[PDB]
């Protein structure tokens, strides 16, 4: 379809960065949008063909280029707080034709990287009363104290990702909502049958993938550098 | 910190010609320069950011290029409202530094001046100052006699119509001790030094 | 749309303080960085500070050490600038400019507040092919002054020269034009308008 | 900007939902309908190049160029249809140079039909360590609303729906936890309750 990378990122103010977006569909028309609350999808740049690009509705602070029909990178000249947005690449057969959008790049510009911090993951075993009352067991997994909101939470039972019975909160909670850059917490629950929980051979792993600092960056602050990592907490089936 | 020495200082040009200005750097500033336009006595407005990219609304005539320590601005096919001081700024490192500027006036052929000598006023004399006017001459030296070349007191200060400078040079117990006060100016259109009394 | 206004015109003799506002409209104030630059008559352009509106984070130029102060008022969405212990040569148009689209890029500017480092009124003296004639003089503080031809009936042929700063430190200028002919001199702060033949 | 569609909308599960946008001050020709879930990009649902109707499964897109009115009809809507729906129009050489122009979007919430509600609050202990306790308010009817935390120490998540697809069972849930000791299992959810089991 339309592959764009990366899905999450943190970069310091004043830094330059290219957002990669490539398509195999041989489409002629490509465009870059930014999506904001209260502003809708606003067009940054668009390219009608190889070697031709033009400004959109909000082009200032960005730059693109179309060397080949297949690709359409988008540059940030100097990262500014106004550039914290969600960026969508799109391709189309023409200016009139419908566009098909990429998955999305969630961007976060920060003045100071000692506010980027990894999460803490904990799994809470189902209540003994819930099993006896509903014959279902709900495990709740908490990802707490992470900044910014670049996380992907998955549920792995016996080392295989599951989707049935999984509910993940759509948006995180502000742990200290009075803060302009408050850390977040996120909760999700996996509901299984009571018999499934009471099979001790059942391995329940709640894994959160956090996108933080790259090794290209500089970490002066004391504790461990907030590099992109996977943080998971594991629970085991309990017969009683 | 960075020193942005700007060239060609201040140039004249006619409309609709590929006229360019340059901005040299002292340290490496990569592509982190901004070209600004300021009208003669108004709010400046940014034109080119990151050394090559126009803001939305900037006409296609304004182009910037260069990288590292050598940066150029081009206004190819100049146009009347694109007639004012232009300066370059860097945003590599704090503190921000700018250029002195490059004002752009209208080029014309040599325009002969119009020298007028104005006697002082008795109302003023009741409190004198002779006045010389170099009305409407192009391009942009005056010496005064009261025959003594008194030096240390005198002071001086594009018209909207035909690109002609008007120039005024004023002189400032010895006035009535002398009889002849002849103005004197030098220029090219007036090839030779073209130069009243008491009553 | 987006705009900036920088305070009323201040005037101070040496040895005081001064505060200049800079009202920012347009986009979200917190995502903006407000920079202050000054430029003296016949001089280069001098950056002397900036503030992060959304974080209160301030960096000033080193040559105005302890002398400039920038504050971001996130509620009323204006930026202040406090030059204190006014040196003799703090005479310039002081500009506030905001980098919003790109960091440190100074996307747009304000009109320009004027601070110059008492008050007195002027006088006008007549100056008896072409026979030009002009009003002139005398000495005034502070600026500005305006002159018009017969209350504004001719713009071609009248040449009014920018004010010069004489030895005493108070300005005077020449206003000439190239039938009844009268200047209309006007001076704002001293309540002085003289229309002399 | 020249597109016109409003914000929030909620419909019970199993009902027909109608969405719409209008575009007066424009002569558009081609009309799309995108669907955007959280943390992903818009997905193309329908596209038409004329006044008329087009149907694909539970979806039906209509265009009335005479009334400058287009509408999307989801029928037998399920909770999985809860997303943000964007209309978009093209083909007008006098608006946006013919390019696509999007409405700011309509938010849809298909509330699950909770047959046999069983509201209750359970306290859950951690698997290994950390001495923390979450509280699970679950199995309540979708008509029940979960209020935000009014205390700075404690916090509560908005109600969320999980589908045990194996047995065609849906159930809303919300969790609450804190470190201050004066909060317990029966405390966190003292906001808009019915008779549960504790």
Author numbering:
A (entry chain B): 3 to 242
B (entry chain L): 1 to 127, 130 to 142, 145 to 150, 152 to 162, 166 to 180, 184 to 206, 209 to 212
C (entry chain H): 1 to 117, 121 to 131, 140 to 189, 198 to 216
D (entry chain A): 3 to 200
Could you pull the original sentences from the published paper?
However, the TCR can also act as an innate receptor, engaging ligands via nonclonal, germline-encoded sites. Therefore, we used antibodies specific for discrete human Vβ regions. Given the number of human Vβ regions and their relatedness, we hypothesized that the high specificity of several such anti-Vβ antibodies might rely on their engaging regions close to or within CDR2 and HV4, akin to BTNL binding to Vγ. Therefore, to explore the consequences of engaging human αβ TCRs only via germline-encoded regions, we have as a proof of principle used TRBV-specific antibodies that we have demonstrated by genetics and biochemistry to engage residues within or close to the counterpart Vγ regions engaged by BTNL molecules, namely, CDR2 and HV4 (19, 20).
Here, we use mutations and structural biology to show that this hypothesis is correct for several Vβ-specific reagents. In sum, although their fine specificities were distinct, the reactivity of each anti-TRBV reagent was commonly determined fully or in part by germline-encoded residues within or juxtaposing CDR2 and HV4. L79 makes hydrophobic interactions with the VL chain, while S80 displays main chain–focused and main-chain–side-chain interactions with VH together with electron densities. In sum, the Vβ-specific antibodies tested here offered a means to engage αβ TCRs via germline-encoded Vβ sequences approximately aligned to Vγ residues engaging BTNL proteins. Affinity maturation was associated with increased cross-reactivity toward TRBV6-1+ J76 cells. Note that the affinities of the two antibodies are comparable (KD = 3 nM for anti-CD3ɛhSP34; KD = 1.8 nM for anti–TRBV6-5AM), so differences in affinity are an unlikely basis for the differences in CD38 and CD25 induction. In sum, TRBV-specific antibodies induced a signature activation phenotype, as assessed by CD25, CD38, and PD-1 expression levels, that was displayed by the great majority of cognate T cells and that was significantly different from the collective phenotypes of αβ T cells responding to anti-CD3ɛ.
